[model samples]
Target: GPHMTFKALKEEGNQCVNDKNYKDALSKYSECLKINNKECAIYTNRALCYLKLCQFEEAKQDCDQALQLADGNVKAFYRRALAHKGLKNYQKSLIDLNKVILLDPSIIEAKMELEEVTRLLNLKD
Candidate 1:
């Protein structure tokens, strides 16, 4: 029952994500995690919630944990870079966005993000 229940919460959370009701989406993800903390998807989804909510530290931490489980997660790296940018850590953002592009050259968003991060990094120097 718990297994199915957490899945329901995760799906519920995902629906809220679709709605852009990220505050409620964060709550759903948290409740799902309380039942199952080992899912990379949960961490990644919750990371987005935090990122959209502008809690960059929490978003970065979520990405860190997700990466521990799935290092090849391109989205995790991209989101973490955004979190770094939010905190004005442009160098770290630059590094992560570069990694994102390296992992998936097809992600035009990451490529564009890399350009933006590079500009920000150069501005700071």
Candidate 2:
């Protein structure tokens, strides 16, 4: 059903996110991605929703799809890092965390996450 364009769906999804409506945003993002899977950002956008929903594996899967579409995408790496963090996969999280910092050193979130993952890895192994 092409009742709504993918752009409108995305816009609505973003609006839902602004309203802190993660579930609505997640559904919209999912619909839009189905409409146009080529959009790299959609995967990462949906990944964020999965993250908020505490669906770490789903987030990881979405980020993986996003990365395939846009290998240099910072959000893809950063979100995947967060997913790994949620999954308690410290080594995997460190890989993405370091990659994010290497791509863009200005991301304070990545930096902080890196520190946390580093400490976790040290304690876990």
Candidate 3:
């Protein structure tokens, strides 16, 4: 496998994401994953699509796979955090958001999410 096809599909998927056509993005990423299942980025992209679709469990599954492929992927952690939040897994979301901040301290979204999750957690106390 030369991988160019997979790369092109990934770009298409990304463009679909930018267009806010998450269903199409998921389809493109699924094709890309079928072409090259070893690509961590594909899993992350698919996870993002799943998130956009409010398929939290599916997003979490893809993010887990992505993390297995690349442990330190900030995007994976960030997305998994969102999935966790959607699933009402507040502690898990906080943990992932903490990791995102640790990995990339300048990510304003991560910091904001961390605060939001923290507030949620506090409310449950």
Candidate 4:
């Protein structure tokens, strides 16, 4: 399976992401994508790389593509929400976060993030 073959490489990219080595992770994920595109996980991986690199639009696009391939992808929506937040599209971010919560209410990160964003929105008025 492509996933099995790419797991080691994906783990390496994940390590890079954890270490904040955005460029390195981008390279690794890009290579993994070149090997396999149907894998929604790779799109999510690349989307994370783009987000870390502050390439918000690209990240959002990848997230959308990932969602198209895999429904109920909480991670994709969460990542896309972050990207939207970076772009200062708070409403869109909030909507995506809401979707994440509906899909998986146990996602504490999504709950916390949404609360914080709501606070910021309240402060704006």
List ranges where model 3 is wrong by over 4 Å.
1-4
Where is the poorest 10-residue window by lDDT in model 1?
A: 1-10
Q: Write the per-residue lDDT of candidate 2 for residues 1-125, one digit (tens) a residue.
A: 75688999999999988888877898998998778988878889888988899988999999999999999899999999899989989999999999998999999988899999989888855
Listed per candidate, the RMSD to the true structure in angstroms reads 2.2, 2.0, 2.7, 3.3
User: Where does the lowest 10-residue lDDT sum fall in candidate 2?
Assistant: 116-125
Runs in model 2 deviating more than 4 A are: 1-3
lDDT of 3 by residue, 77-102 (tens): 99999999999898999999999888
Candidate 4 residue lDDT tens string, 5-66: 46777888888989989779888877777777777887887899899889999999989989
Candidate 4: give the clashing pairs. Answer: none
lDDT of 4: 0.85
The TM-score, computed over Cα atoms with residue i paired to residue i, of candidate 3 is: 0.92
lDDT of candidate 1 at residue 92, scale 0 to 100: 94
For each candidate in the order shown, give its overall lDDT on alpha carbons: 0.88, 0.89, 0.90, 0.85
- How high is each candidate's TM-score? 0.92, 0.93, 0.92, 0.84
Q: How many clashes (backbone atoms < 3 Å, residues ≥3 apart in a chain or on different chains) does model 2 have?
A: 0
Candidate 1: lDDT over CA atoms? 0.88
Q: Per model, state how many residue pairs clash.
A: 0, 0, 0, 0
Best by lDDT: 3
Model 3 misses residue 69 by how many Å? Answer: 0.7
